[PDB]
């Protein structure tokens, strides 16, 4: 009795009781799996379509056709032939989109203003009904794919990824190159024949079948309405009845086992990768054997494996468990980072891994553990934070291929059966004869034979001698490896306290004293048994010079290091904390189930105020920290540009250079002395937010104070004597440039900042609307036409109460060229604005309003927003409504004037600075015309530079 | 054979061999004693006339007629009848003048541009040949005299002065009121008859006689030329053959002896004054018995009297020796400040004084001591720094009454005969039966019977019981009081090192390293065996908050406190040091004979780096420091205005309030810990200047470094990471006012700052020429016509690289009135400038040039100038020539424009701030017309105030 397009309906979708959203499952006649989500309060709607095809179905001759294809798909359709029609519609209706290819999945998704779902879906749908696939872009698009590849070329992580693929069976599709590039996309085709337009079309026509598609749609409309909408748009997708691809033989045969790889990294890291091929455990999701083992093998603290490897001073971090492969196969991995001593004991490290394993075989599957995991995940599922719509549908579309409708939400969180047998089964694969091991370290440089062909990775491939393998099999049992004990942090009070009648819509200041300032809000919307605790400890000794910055950093690193064992239980129990230094002191945050928060907070604070430094932990943390500062050189060029702009524009900021130099003056005695000093006098500013009462907030706040006062003898640092840092003020019509060499990448980085004025409602909305207007053109113009790089960003920059427009580009071209192109873009944008219809303008106003008003979905999102107002000392909690009201009154002329005053080449108040991060070797047409530009004043000393310019005031508190 | 006007010539004037100046003594026929000084290199000339009449010859009915008289004398003459002709001539020719009355002397002096000596002297001379004495000023002048009196009314020092006079014989002129006021000057005359115009004339005509006058004149002209000039101008002064006044009976008879006075102070101090009347020792200057005793009784360190009084924790400072009275009598005094414990032991304190005395009688005069004093003073005289001309002639004119021509220079420095007899003679007066004692302390408040009539001082007068007197006579001998030992610091190497051929005209940077920056110049002009050593130690821990400011202060106070005994010898030996904290760290300066500098510097630095705090010294220094912060409330209203402006305009500055509050958190352990921290990391910037070689400078600099590094383990604070403070930047057209209560004075204070722009050659000379032009009008208008107060100041203000115009007034009127009057003055000045002749303008340019170019006369003057360039990090050593060159190119129009841009009510870039320090009770006509003014923005929080305004850059180094 269902509509002819629908085979089967619903299933009753099993969801969390807390979840007010309404759900319905569907199976279209044409084989499409579908989940509809009705949320009547949602500000943005969203949809995702996932194709169960990826780079694994890439033809042998054209690797990356899959990736290439989704690039081409966005590029206009028969009904909507404009090349950027999709994205421009999304931009102009508060929307955004993205897409991705993995081995077996291609996932396309977007969100949009809830009032225009139908129109966003009609367009998205066309991509699966009639793509133009025209060759005017086929040639450009390749550039974007190429630089995409290029950017990741020097990225270690990606290099290792594609290196585990070539270290495997070449006649297995796993070995194929997923990303693609210009070398195998435009080029190999002409010089070997073959039309990459015809090839695309074939692929798209063999593999783009409805039987292999899943869709998820979220909107305000009712389920019935969404049903019709979906049926109408998607029911006529073409079914090709493609058998689902499968890879059951497994990419790593006995020949690839017992292998060892010495890889040379770009960054100066030391990592060890251990890998056991395993059969596909997908079908077993109701019991999850691979992650019961992952849970014990990647466990931390008391008696765990990592604990031991840490005590030998061999390893700092351990991650272990099951890893995706493709339908038919998986892997079980165990990764660790090596200390200096660790790198000399790889063999002995691994022996310990098999020793813990062996201990598992000895001990055998344990029901109480699985039972514990079961109960945590259940609560975790019930009390899951409400997700952002765009990320939810995308995740759901993917999961639709693996589970029945009624179980698409609960799958992967809820366990059921306990299965000792399945667990033993996987356990049996973890043996020396199944092991692939990979060491990454710069100590191999110059002495590698092989070049992985796509990324260029140096590396050695060798076989692990029999005796070694034999030693590992001779893995007996190390007494130390104990199992985890019952989890004390598992919460049992999920009572949601009633809303105090004195409650308020924004955080209220409930305590203003010389020692502490406490902001507090009781949750009035999410009603989950969760609380966010935020503390900012102020002390001048944290950032007073580079030596104390270093000491502040090491202190917390050392503190966290020794709390870890104890803290892991909490984390598994959905209770986490963060602790880091800042230019003002230290930041302590605790999030999660509120029930046992007070016990964790007590332990952290106690340890803070009574800490005692293990000599040995000290040198390791320091050597790591040391190596980490050096490692900054390896970062992306754009990441460097941003780092230097931040230093440049701040009255006081210590560069990594300065920190490195000062690090060698840090000894154990010095550090021991510095702690009491740091803790000697303090001011604390706090936000406590969530499922807590006023009484409970003050109580939590007292215990922090009292624990410090009694144990470290802390006394009050009056707020009035806390020195805050100002932003540097650029001179009218000035242009400064700071130029630096990057010594790894053959790409250059660039950040251009046009500083405007002190933050305020009007200045804020001028900058933000102007940015909205240019957000998609910047993308469509500088990236999708001019192909200047994979990274092309524009938008607002905020810091120290000041703001301005920034552009960020990573590119093969020289900075001065990017620079000229950006100015060229600025002119076009100005004309574009002069020549834009009023109603297009209003859509831009309306689009920015929607983004701004879009309410946080979860506590930590609402919390972070408020914490932003505290950090910045503006305390403007009602900001969003105010600014949007003001936004709605702007007119084209206002934005034009704004532009002419602040941003034009000829602006009387242009304030421009550029950071140019030069490539390794570098350096020092129909296109629109760039204006002539001034000669930059060149910065050779950030300090001299700042000393010679005035400083901004600080922003007045709201 | 001498000119008929000259009785006797010269004497051959005994002078220092080092002294290139030429001298000649004279005795005019009319009894005038005269010294001429020819200095052909002098930039400014000078003269002084001293009359041997003072407030002691004041008629009984009109006290202060003497003071009054010299006010009236400046007020125009028959030949030069313009009321301010004298001072306006001096202003317009790089000159300045002043005058003063004491008991037996009235001293008038001026300096002037060397090119216009004759014209300045002609006018000065008229005052002693034919004063108009007109009654149009007689009525105004009284105001200035009155506020003069009023200002000192709340000044403790003056109150005690006039209180020792009324505690004496009323029929002795000593008891008369010296200052005068409106109460006894305009008033008592009408209501008791008597013309204060006729009275003046009488006085002036009985006492203003040539026989009682001495003159001293310094100019470029030759001695012969000065002779004629003087004879011509002064030979016809009228001789009245007044017998020289004398007061031989003595103001304090046996009735006033054995007295005790409990005085209530304005400031919260504790002081004890012990006073022995003695006969006049003037005649005995060749042997100076009073100051051989002063030398031993006011000695400090090893075995001295003060040492003991300090160990009992009774007293911090001791000053002892002979004190001026008047021809016929003197006093020998011994003053100390009391700790809290001291005030409870006055009796026991004094007993110790007589015990030391008794020890002197026991021991008897010692030839070696007098011999030591003799030799020090001789070297001191030979190597005396060349004096500023204005202060030299004034001093010499005074000394001309007491010594023969040929000995006027050497008198009071050179000893001759040793006279055990004279010493014993004075020693015999120091006995309990001769003693007057005075205690000053707020602990007496409310319980005094008597009001000294002129100042209003509360106080009790009582007689010292017999037994007390008896106890003091029963002053035996305290073992501890040892004599001073031979003086090891007495220098013996006065060799002037040859001028290295690599020498330079300005300090050169000879050492730029992470630990130290060393500026060095070898003396190329004074050639005295003297050196100035200046060290600025930078550490952020000195001023990081109020607690560390306090600790930095106490540290140095404690350090100096324990070095004193050791240092006194040096000081007597012409070798001194200064040591104080700053917002950047600490300042150590050492000046004097270079020979033993290195031994003193070594001891100071050593002690700095190894200091150990006596518990007991600690509480005393702290209680004193504490009391001292409270005592700021007692300061002059104008002094408060200046203090608050400095806080207001500096990015970071800790108020005395903040320091007081933070002081109670300072304990001994805390302080002990803070020292190593402070010394932990340091940067040093030095100026070494004088009679030292490059090799000797570096050597001196190394020993400071090496002594710190080896003993406190100091390591380098890189200069680049030293945070310097900026000046606050006022907004265009802004007017801010900070208003505060003064709780002691019935006068209000005011400072008005019109901030201009960052310092630079042009901005500097605009402000400085404008100031020159208005310097005398401001005086003549706001003070001498409008009589707004005794304190009326205007001129340049420099701080943190910024500058502006300031006016400072202390007044009976309310701030808003002064404020209006000042603006009224500004308008007049503008018109005055528009309407001033070109050649009058040029004289102003020429007058400022002369002041600026006028070369330093001594090492520490040249040193201080250079140290100014270092402190301020501008290093503009050739400043003076540059700025004057630029000065000479300015025109009226430039100054007008300057004024219209920056200073007018209507200036588009006026930047005005006013500090108003209100009187105790207060508050919150032909006159020129004040313009309407804006409503001030009012400051209630210096901090909020600064946070809301931008900050200036720092000035670029030259």
Residue numbers in the entry:
A (entry chain A), B (entry chain A): 42 to 965, 978 to 1011
The paper states:
Insulysin (EC 3.4.24.56; also referred to as insulin-degrading enzyme or IDE) is a zinc metallopeptidase in the M16 family that has been extensively studied because of its role in cellular insulin degradation and amyloid beta peptide catabolism. IDE exists predominantly as a dimer in equilibrium with tetramers and to a lesser extent monomers. It is unique among the enzymes comprising the zinc metallopeptidase M16 family in that it exhibits allosteric kinetic behavior with substrate peptides increasing its activity. Crystal structures of human IDE (hIDE) complexed with peptides show that the enzyme consists of four structurally related domains that adopt a clamshell-like structure enclosing a large central chamber.
